Amino acid sequence: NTIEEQLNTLEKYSQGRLGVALINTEDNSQITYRGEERFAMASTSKVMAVAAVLKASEKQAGLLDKNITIKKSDLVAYSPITEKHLTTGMTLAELSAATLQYSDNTAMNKILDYLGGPAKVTQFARSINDVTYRLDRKEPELNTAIHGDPRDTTSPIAMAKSLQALTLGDALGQSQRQQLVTWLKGNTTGDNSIKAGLPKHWVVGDKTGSGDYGTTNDIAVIWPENHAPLILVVYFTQQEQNAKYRKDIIAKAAEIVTKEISNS
């Protein structure tokens, strides 16, 4: 179709590899581009990890309030929130909020430690029928995004379906799915990604991703004006290891796939 050709054209313009998956809950339809191809998730991988914690809190009251100690040896690159809590520590709820809204990397690692490792997140993904998601490493290693390397990757459609299941679906309990939605709506890093390609009055809950090879990602749940929610995943990666990020590509992809929706 037209959207199809527009995304192909956008990819040519980008000079990289673009992946898109849009699920429209109004008519349960999906628009995809390289929807089944694997892309390095970078920080977008954090959503599944937090969801695993939320799921665990369903059978263990007060789990989110469990305080976790943060050691100086735990600190990795870019940990804006965690580095300020070496003495007080942080609860699993605070760690989840920090990793999602600021993309705090130590927070992700602490969550992984609690769960039992990256493999445990992959296991959670399988528990919600996501057979594509795979987390193999922690931060910062999971960001290598080497071409032809399967580690820490997933597909646009797989992540779109999982995000839908975790927020609007039944993968998590009501209190938990709402908590996830609330954390996402408060993200501080997505102003220039998916949000930048949507009407200013639409409500968005997103989680960005940035890695080697100029990997630029963003996944989100969108609440358009008087319209059922949408789930959108946009992954983008480039040829050279030191490529610069291209959020402009994400913004345009979002505009292209939601244009028709915003016009009616």
Swiss-Prot record:
The keyword Signal applies. It is an enzyme of class 3 (hydrolase). Transmembrane segments: none annotated. Its EC number is 3.5.2.6. The class A beta-lactamase family has a specific amino-acid numbering system, sometimes called Ambler or ABL numbering and often misspelt as Amber. A multiple sequence alignment was used to derive a consensus sequence and then the consensus was numbered taking into account insertions and deletions. This allows use of identical numbers, e.g. for active site residues, despite differences in protein length. UniProt always uses natural numbering of residues, hence there appear to be differences in numbering between this entry and some papers. Monomer. Hydrolyzes broad-spectrum beta-lactam antibiotics. Active against cephalosporins such as cefuroxime and cefotaxime. This is Beta-lactamase. It comes from Proteus vulgaris.
